Amino acid sequence: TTIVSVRRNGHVVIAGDGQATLGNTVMKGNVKKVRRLYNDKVIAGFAGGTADAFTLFELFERKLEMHQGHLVKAAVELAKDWRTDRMLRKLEALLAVADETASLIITGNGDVVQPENDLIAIGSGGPYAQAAARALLENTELSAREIAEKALDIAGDICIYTNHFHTIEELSYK
Amino acid sequence: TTIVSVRRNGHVVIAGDGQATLGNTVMKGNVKKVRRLYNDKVIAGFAGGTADAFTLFELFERKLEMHQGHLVKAAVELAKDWRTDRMLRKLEALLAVADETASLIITGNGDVVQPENDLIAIGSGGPYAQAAARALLENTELSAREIAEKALDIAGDICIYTNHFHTIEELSYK
Amino acid sequence: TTIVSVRRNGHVVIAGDGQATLGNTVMKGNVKKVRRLYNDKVIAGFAGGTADAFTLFELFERKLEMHQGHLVKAAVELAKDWRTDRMLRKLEALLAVADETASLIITGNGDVVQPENDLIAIGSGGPYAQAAARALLENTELSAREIAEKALDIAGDICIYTNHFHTIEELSYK
Amino acid sequence: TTIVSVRRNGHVVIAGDGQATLGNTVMKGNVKKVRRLYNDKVIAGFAGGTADAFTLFELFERKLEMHQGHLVKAAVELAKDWRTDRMLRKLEALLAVADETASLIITGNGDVVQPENDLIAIGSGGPYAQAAARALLENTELSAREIAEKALDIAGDICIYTNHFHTIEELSYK
Amino acid sequence: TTIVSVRRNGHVVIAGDGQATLGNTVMKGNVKKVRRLYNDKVIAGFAGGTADAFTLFELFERKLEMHQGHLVKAAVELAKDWRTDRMLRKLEALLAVADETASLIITGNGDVVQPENDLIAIGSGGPYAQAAARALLENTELSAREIAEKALDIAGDICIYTNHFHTIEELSYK
Amino acid sequence: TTIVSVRRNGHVVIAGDGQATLGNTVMKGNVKKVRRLYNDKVIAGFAGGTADAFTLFELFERKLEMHQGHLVKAAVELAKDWRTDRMLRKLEALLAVADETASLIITGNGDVVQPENDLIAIGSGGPYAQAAARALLENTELSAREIAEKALDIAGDICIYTNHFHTIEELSYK
Amino acid sequence: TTIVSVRRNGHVVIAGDGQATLGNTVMKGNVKKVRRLYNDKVIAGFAGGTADAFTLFELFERKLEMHQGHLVKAAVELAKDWRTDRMLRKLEALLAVADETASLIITGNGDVVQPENDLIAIGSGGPYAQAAARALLENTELSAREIAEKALDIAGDICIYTNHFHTIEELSYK
Amino acid sequence: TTIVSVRRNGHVVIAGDGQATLGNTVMKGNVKKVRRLYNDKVIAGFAGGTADAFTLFELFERKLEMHQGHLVKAAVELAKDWRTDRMLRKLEALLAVADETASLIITGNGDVVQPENDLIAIGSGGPYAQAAARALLENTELSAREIAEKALDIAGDICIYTNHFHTIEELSYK
Amino acid sequence: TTIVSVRRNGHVVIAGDGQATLGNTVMKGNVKKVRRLYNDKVIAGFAGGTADAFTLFELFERKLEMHQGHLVKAAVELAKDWRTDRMLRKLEALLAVADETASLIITGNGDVVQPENDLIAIGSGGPYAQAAARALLENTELSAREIAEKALDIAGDICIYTNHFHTIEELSYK
Amino acid sequence: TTIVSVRRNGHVVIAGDGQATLGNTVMKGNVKKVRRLYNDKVIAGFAGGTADAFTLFELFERKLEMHQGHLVKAAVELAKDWRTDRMLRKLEALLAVADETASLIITGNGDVVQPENDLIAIGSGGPYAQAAARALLENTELSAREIAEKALDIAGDICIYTNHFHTIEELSYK
Amino acid sequence: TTIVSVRRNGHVVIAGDGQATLGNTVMKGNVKKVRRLYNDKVIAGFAGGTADAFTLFELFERKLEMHQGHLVKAAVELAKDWRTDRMLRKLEALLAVADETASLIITGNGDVVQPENDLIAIGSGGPYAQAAARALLENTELSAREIAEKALDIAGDICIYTNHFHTIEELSYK
């Protein structure tokens, strides 16, 4: 699995592969690891079980309602309940979410992280995508969609757990 | 890795993928796992280190010279020296070879095997290819090349260690 | 265990083996892993404990009555209660169900999935059946019953946990 | 794998299945686990790698030549060299051999064993065959071939690593 | 441990050994692994801790009272509570039970199973008894008590964890 | 396996069981673990592979020839070559031997041991036999044969790897 | 550790970091993982113990002398001896080497590999460098030295086992 | 991660690195592991999840308000609730805090500790920083800011989990 | 164990602790881990078995004789024979040696290393000593003897395997 | 860690070291592992986490209040709750406590133990202190304080996890 | 096992227990772990297999002959061959030896050690004996025989693997 997020020129995107591996075999190649949330004001992705993310994303929208859509404060309340609750602690996934404000990662250890330049790359292929996206972001004028697309394809050629099926959700705020 | 061999209507083929995995990373995608031997009278493939096969294939040609190209007897002398020699015992690979006579597998345990109907499928994706090749060979009139081609593509979609780069060497005897 | 579902030409079927393994021994070879539900409007299968499926199937009929037989919405409510309830969370099985509308998989992680082309293949032999059913569905005009039948036989030859005892429930809607 | 030996009414037989398992997959179903040795005066079988047995059986014939075909003394010299030699110690297999004199087992630990009533049952399904063969030998007048045949089929129904492909080598001495 | 159940000519029996092993030593040789239940209308046996079975058997009689002695439906409610309850999930045992209606196995995974011909063989020696009982049942007219007795003695000679102390509870319904 | 040696009133004996275990299965119950050596002047037993002892006992007779039947000095030369030779080092067994002079144990570590009161008890059941033989030797006037017999039967009831088949070789010197 | 090789516009380079980690500690930061060979006609790098590479590189020069500097044939003879010799088999390292002809990887499994486009990236940070170098090579006109330099710095920011100390050996052939 | 605190000449400081590691990769290099609390009268740092510290820090300010800013008594009440609460027990972090009164460590085991000389060094690189800060504090007149600065840089050169991004909060009381 | 080497102002020193640990026990506290070599022109230390170093140091003096006292070239010939010889390969130790020319480390992997600034710190406490010696060498004018002394004492307070018994051999060249 | 208790001539003492080890490093050398309880009528020590003991000691004083200071009966109620409560069961420590009545040990297994002569020695170095304290107690007239002091210093020289920092609490009752 | 060596007032002794444990069982209680060597000029003991020591002690006498009885130089040549030879490397034991010159330990790692004050204590009970012998040697005028005797008895009371059977070899030189 690989998921990438890039932010440039008033645009931010999240892209991810569709591969679902079981042991050494491919279970499903068209998985939708990216979706929109909170009245399509937020984009998010996940690396892990599909139901585990749908549970976390739904609660994340409830934390946004309590905090009026504030991304960072809702992300900490989600990470707080995630490590806390005995039921949520069992969940195993790597969340990625972003809005016009900023991009950040969420984890089951309770750690909330905003990468340098708001460049997120997670999953088994994440480090590979981060090395490609860091190269284009500094040496090209390409739009964030073009970077996340080409970076994800490079990670699929490298990572055996990632494929070239793609799903993207751009957000323009300019 | 996946390699397939099919024999039908006076034709026999060997096909294999080009993927070379290192851990969870793709090292090389265009590997040539198939080649010809003994004045292009024999086709063969291998699953494992490239050099380990080049050593075994060279000696296999010499065993053919001593036995005047007899495939079965040369394969046993290769399997005999393979398990015996302290040098060759360190080699780890799965050989596949065929001629107009018959198809058979060779292993580092010394085991020489001719599959039912001379249908070989080896590598990490081998069982997946055997399941598809078995379905077409009984339910279709397709030529051995068409079966090995479609079977290898299905194994690449399933096996994470197999890709869709292909190399084939057909042998027509009619 | 292996279970297959195919949909073609107004017909959809579910087929599964009868093998029940205990460690390295065969406990029972004639297990009925397929049955009908909801006034015989729905066919379903299961890989796992017999009682765990009978509990999930009965509740699944309940969810269908609340949703007037809607397959997708009832499957979500079942996956919702499955992950949620402390009693149901202990259950371990892989459900497969289909109607004239569509085919989909249900899991104990809460994940509801509809495969490409509505081709389901689950159990320890599932990937082997998917490889064979994928080959026939694209390369032959065979009916969905003939594909699930031949595919399950190939999976039994390959998988050691699968046998050739078969149970099928076709549904014709045309 | 399962192999059985029965001796009755001047007749002795060795029967074994053809299944070759790789992990949870069936690699080959028609394996010949039984053969004849020393001018067809001796029958033998093996559970393990095919070449490991071909090496041990060849040397066993040489031990018979030095001891003029004496089964027991040659079996001890084989078991002596087997545990002794650094090359032979790496071999892993379970040998079964018999002649008109007596039946006995040979192992890689150096242990030579002649079962009660000269009833051998080895392999992963061996104990299952021994329980069936013990039942018929005491409660029926069936010939040793009929017992080994029916016993091996019962072991294939129970053991997942054993199948119903059969190979037999009877020896009549009366 | 070994337990056997046979059904023939209007008779059904359950037999089991008395051996209780602790590591490599025999703790007790006269254990009663068989008993009667529900007004002596039901016979049952268990492989595992003695108290774990006495707990399961008592609840099984309560499930029979709720279901008016129906064997199958009460067995599923027992298997349902067994996997469900946090206290019952800790229990580790293999139940065997039968009445004039049918014989079936119960497990801690929630799996309810009725073997072919209602022939049950469980415990460490179970597969050995199943191979002997299958031989006599097809090749002899022996009564179910005679088969379970001789089959259990064969399993005790083979299994090191089984002994020849025996306890039986026959049920005649004709 | 269990082997016992007792010396009393001018008499010394060696007794051992016949059980040969393979995993959790009984391979052979009538094994002869006791025999005579050096013109019936010496009695000996072994716990381990049959052939491994026949090799060590043969060489032990040769060490007796060089030392004119001296038990202790020949036992050290055997223990010396046992740990030294690369061939003999692979042997795994526990030897027990005695004559009119004294009783002692020999091991593959090279250790030669004479127990207190020349009471030997080896094998998986050895400690159990030593506990019973120690009780009778101090609290009864029973002859060494009666002690080794009753002690070995008690070890067979306790040890699962030991059975009640017995083989004895007494030596009277008075 | 990270090492990169790039070939463009008649130029080829090999670059690597200087970090040497011991557990969670940095042992040395200025390690020279790159050097020249065969009269400065060949450049090479290594990931692993420093002396393990100095031994392999010395023998690699000798293989070049026997083959008159042929890179591919000498690399196979090195990989052949590497897996073969009992002394060389103990060595653990990942070699990278290139000349004006082509670039290729060598491994202790005997596997010789030439990556797509002759782009090598090995070490714990190798996949990260490959994702960055793949991005620049397709989207920029930068020289091979500029790509390997920027790619190695990105891998040092990501990999914890890689640092920004650099050593490079360019080869111009035009 | 590494965090250091030094107190000298009426001044006390807390310094920490910005590295955030995920497995063997760097997630974020500019993490702010140091901040001020209680109307900027208190400085504190944390090693662990960002949100877990923000929760503990907020509660720590609460305990300070109940105890009128007393550092020691508030730290005990925080350590008391930390071990006690089922929610807070799940939190995993290492807190460091100091004021003009004294410096002390807090842990999830409930242990409150004041180091010798009020020298705190925590995180994976903590012992390395303590070794360097101990050397300068005794052998130099450097101010506490200069010691924590140079000590944290040395820990980043050694620890692979620590980097040279720095955040400091000095407190002057004189 | 800890050993330190420092070079300053025409002076170079080697210091090491005397602790010898066996498991969790102190075997000897006054071990001399430092000594002089080659007519007192060279100082050296070792971390490991006492005899293993005495063998390597003796041969190192012979390599100096062949190379006329050249430190670097003799160290490579020692590292060459160390990994090569089957006898020397079994030795396990970490050597440290220095003369007026330069300081360097030698290892059993064959790796010869000269640290930055010729600062050596090895043993279980080596990294702790390097952290303290690095702090004083840059922030103080202290002589190399004073640095190695204070650094080794700090490593003994931290490392549990290091104590405060000291042995030093200075070399003045100015 | 090491803790010692000695009782002589109307005096009883408890002494313990200050070392706190983390892996192979010393975390803190001045730990106070000894303290007084119940109006300074009781002395106690602990080996383990500091907070775990402060929890157990506080509850132990409450058990003394319910039992009017009776040492033994309060120790059993503490050991009873310790094994019982799900929260206290997680605690890991070795308690030592004494009064004018008697000395005894308490454990997390629920075991209450009073050593011979009321001589307690616990911790990783406990057995070493017990061997020294047993020597002086029988062969010298030294007071209990002198024995616990010299015994603890001997354990610190031997145990690597124990140091020479000491804390003592004597109780005189005469 | 426990072995002690003490040197005082022109006398030196070596004492050891007779216990030989197999798992949780006592194999032999009267083992002689102490003996004399080199014309009764040297005393020695061993912890480990009896024959492993007899081989090492024999070669140790040969090293003494080559070095004219020099204890230290012969001990290094023994430790050199011990780690070196492929045969001797397999031996596992802890040697203790002393003469009028000095006492020292020898190990299979090649480490030669002379304890402080020439006080050796090895075996599983060694540290317990060292703590008792250290107490008496400083606080009493007792002779070395009295110290080793009382120290070994205390170690047998503490260590479960040590008993009170004793063997001593004193050497007087005055």
Is D55 one of the annotated binding-site residues?
A: no
* Whether G13 contacts G170, CB under 8 Å: yes
Instruction: For residue F96, list its beta bridge partners.
Output: F45, F105
User: Do the Cβ atoms of D37 and D60 come closer than 8 Å?
Assistant: yes
Packed helices F71-84 and F50-66: angle between N→C axes, nearest 10 degrees: 130
Its sign, for the CA torsion D21, D26, D28, D31, is positive
Helix axes K71-84, I50-66, angle to 10 degrees: 90
* K89 contacts chain F (CB < 8 A): no
State which residue of chain C sits closest to E83, comparing Cα positions: C90
Whole-angstrom distance, CA of residue A48 vs CA of residue A33: 9
- Cα separations (Å) of I102 from A99, B104, C81, G28? 58, 63, 72, 17
Cα separation, J120 vs J16, whole angstroms: 11
Burial of K23 (0-12, 13-18, 19+ CB in 10 A): exposed
Query: Would you tell me the crossing angle of helices D50-66 and B71-84 to the nearest 10 degrees?
Result: 80
Q: What are phi and psi of D85, to 5 degrees?
A: -60, 135
CA distances from H148 to G25, H8, H151, K60 (A): 20, 11, 5, 56
Task: Identify the three-state secondary structure at position H47.
Answer: strand
**Using a CB cutoff of 8 Å and minimum separation of 24, what contacts does I56-63 make?**
I56/I82, I56/I88, I56/I91, I56/I93, I56/I95, I56/I106, I57/I95, I60/I95, I60/I97, I61/I37
Closest CA to E71 of E41, E47, E45: E41
**CA-to-CA separations, A18 to A161, A166, C127, G45, in angstroms, rounded:** 10, 6, 18, 36
Query: Which residues, numbered 18 to 47 in chain H, qualify as contacts with chain A under a Cβ-Cβ cut-off of 8 Å?
Result: 20, 25, 27-31
Q: Which residue of G has its CA nearest to A124?
A: G127
User: Quick one: closest CA in A to G155, which residue?
Assistant: A131
Query: Which two tokens mark D12?
Result: 């002795």
User: Active-site residue K25, yes or no?
Assistant: no
Q: Are B21 and A160 a contacting pair at CB < 8 A? A: yes
Asked how this structure was determined, the answer is X-ray
For chain E, say whether D4 makes contact (Cβ under 8 Å).
no
- Cα end-to-end distance, chain A, whole Å: 30
Provide, as residue numbers in chain B, all residues whose Cβ is less than 8 Å from the Cβ of C131.
128-129, 131-132, 154-155, 158
Question: Could you tell me which of F28, G64, A55, F94 has the C-alpha nearest to residue D107?
Answer: F28
The residue among J15, J10, J11 whose CA lies nearest residue J120 is: J15
Q: How many helices (H) and strands (E) does chain D have?
A: 5, 11
Strand partners, F45: F34, F96
- What does the buried/exposed string (b/e) look like for H6-29 if buried means 16 or more CB atoms within 10 Å of the residue's CB? bbbeebbbbbbbbbbbbeebbbbb
Please name which of E156, E116, E145, E167 lies closest in space to residue E2, comparing C-alpha atoms: E156
* Sequential DSSP letters for F9-42: TTEEEEEEE--EEETTEEEES----EEEETTTTE
Give me the count of residues in chain H: 174
Cβ within 8 Å, pair C151-B134:
no
Alpha carbon distances (Å) from G1 to F170, G29, J76: 71, 11, 57
Cα–Cα distance, I129 to I137 (Å, whole number): 12
Task: State the Cα–Cα distance between residues I86 and I95, nearest whole angstrom.
Answer: 19
As beta bridge partners, residue I35 has I44
Longest pairwise C-alpha distance within chain H? 46
* Dihedral pair phi/psi, residue A167, rounded to 5°: -140, 130
Q: Give me the DSSP letters along E70-119.
A: -HHHHHHHHHHHHHHSHHHHT--EEEEEE-SS-EEEE-TTS-EE--GGG-
Candidates E29, C117, B125, H68; CA nearest to D22 is B125
Beta bridge partners of F42: F37
Tokens of K124: 């599983």
Place of tokens 């002396």: G51
Give residue D156's Cα distance to chain centre: 16
SS3 H158: helix
User: Which of D110, D56, D59, D103 lies closest to D83, judged by CA?
Assistant: D110
Annotated binding residue at I156? Answer: yes
User: To 5 degrees, how large is the angle CA C94–CA C98–CA C103?
Assistant: 85
| d(CA C109, nearest CA chain A) in Å | 6
Quick one: tokens of F127? 């400690």
Residue of chain I whose alpha carbon sits nearest to that of H132: I132
Closest CA–CA distance from residue G70 to any residue of chain A (Å): 29
SS3 state of residue C42: strand
Q: Which residues pair with F37 in a beta bridge?
A: F42
Domain span at B95: 1-174
The CA distance from H86 to F145, in Å, is 68
* Single-letter residue type at G155: A
Contacts E160 to F, Cβ<8 Å = 21, 24-26, 160-161
Task: Give the CB-side neighbour count of residue B12, counting CA atoms within 13 A.
Answer: 23
- Yes or no: say if B49 and G109 are a contact pair by the CB < 8 Å rule: yes
Inter-residue contact I129 to I45 (CB < 8 Å): no
**Residue of chain C whose alpha carbon sits nearest to that of D1:** C24
CATH code at position I1: 3.60.20.10
The answer to whether F111 contacts K29, with C-beta atoms less than 8 Å apart, is no
Report the alpha-carbon distance of residue C125 to residue C118 in Å, rounded. 18
Q: Cβ of K105 and I27 within 8 Å?
A: yes
Given an 8 Å threshold on Cβ–Cβ distance, is B109 in contact with D30?
Answer: no
| Chain I partners within 8 Å of G47 (Cβ) | none
3-state secondary structure of I113: strand
Residue whose C-alpha is closest to residue D63's, from D40, D80, D46: D80
Structure tokens at B61: 């040609």
d(CA D160, CA D24): 10
Which of left, alpha, beta for I23 (phi over 0: left; psi -120 to 50: alpha)? left
Reported resolution in A? Answer: 3.0
Number of folded domains that form chain K: 1
Percent helix, strand and coil across chain I, each to the nearest 5: 40, 30, 30
> Residue G27, CB half-sphere, CA atoms under 13 Å: how many?
15
Could you tell me which residues are beta bridge partners of residue G15?
A: G4, G168
Are H136 and H159 in contact by the 8 Å Cβ rule? The answer is no
Q: Which of B24, B128, B158 sits opposite A161 (nearest CB)?
A: B24
Tokens of A91: 């969940």
Distance from the Cα of residue D98 to its chain's centroid:
8
Residue of D86, D60, D62 lying closest to D75 (CA atoms): D60
H-only helix segments in H10-124: 50-66, 71-84, 86-89
| C145–chain B Cβ distance below 8 A for any pair | no
Please tell me whether C107 is known to bind a ligand: no
The token duo for K76 is 């290094």
The CA-based angle H24-H30-H36, given to 5 degrees, is: 125
Partner J contacted by H111 (CB < 8 A): yes
Q: Which residues lie below 8 Å from residue C138, measured CB to CB, with a gap of 6+?
A: none
Closest by CA position to A80, among listed H81, H51, H79, H56 = H51
* HSE of H30, CA atoms in CB hemisphere, 13 A: 5
Instruction: Please report, as a single letter, which amino acid is at residue A136.
Output: L
Strand partners, F36: F43
**3-class secondary structure, A24:** coil
CB spacing of D115 vs F86 below 8 angstroms:
no
Across I23-136, the runs of DSSP E, i.e. the strands, are 25-28, 34-37, 42-48, 93-98, 103-107, 112-113, 120-122
Query: CB neighbours of F118 closer than 8 A, spacing ≥ 6?
Result: F5, F7, F12, F98, F102, F103, F104
DSSP alpha helix (H) spans, chain E:
50-66, 71-84, 86-89, 126-139, 144-158
Instruction: Identify the CA nearest to F22 among candidates E26, D127, E21.
Output: D127
User: Going along chain G, which residue ranges are E strands?
Assistant: 3-8, 11-17, 20-22, 25-28, 34-37, 42-48, 93-98, 103-106, 112-113, 120-122, 166-172
CA gap B13, B32 in Å, rounded:
15
Please give the Cα distance from G94 to C83 (Å, whole number).
46
Q: Which amino acid is located at H8 in the chain?
A: R
Report DSSP state, residue H140: -
H/E segment holding residue A25? strand A25-28
Please say whether the beta carbons of K29 and F114 come within 8 A. Answer: no
- Cα(I94)–Cα(I48) distance, rounded to whole angstroms? 7
Buried/exposed B27-58: b ≥16 CB within 10 Å, e otherwise? bbeebebbbebbeeebbbbbbbbbbbbbbbbe
C26 contacts on D by Cβ (under 8 Å):
157-160
Distance (Å) from the alpha carbon of H52 to chain A's nearest alpha carbon: 7
Q: How far apart are CA G19 and CA G28, in angstroms?
A: 6
| The one-letter amino acid at G56 | L
> Can you state the angle between helices A71-84 and H50-66, rounded to 10 degrees?
90
- What is the Cα–Cα distance from E29 to E46, expressed in whole angstroms? 15
Query: With contact defined as beta carbons under 8 Å apart, do J79 and J112 qualify?
Result: yes
The three-state DSSP-derived secondary structure of J86-111 is: HHHHCCCEEEEEECCCCEEEECCCCC
| Contacts with G167 (C-beta within 8 Å, 6 or more apart), sequence order | G15, G16, G18, G32, G33, G34
Interchain touch J–A (≥3 Cβ pairs closer than 8 Å): no
Where does K69-165 show beta strands of DSSP type E?
A: 93-98, 103-106, 112-113, 120-122
Q: What residues in H contact I134, CB-CB < 8 Å?
A: 132, 154, 157
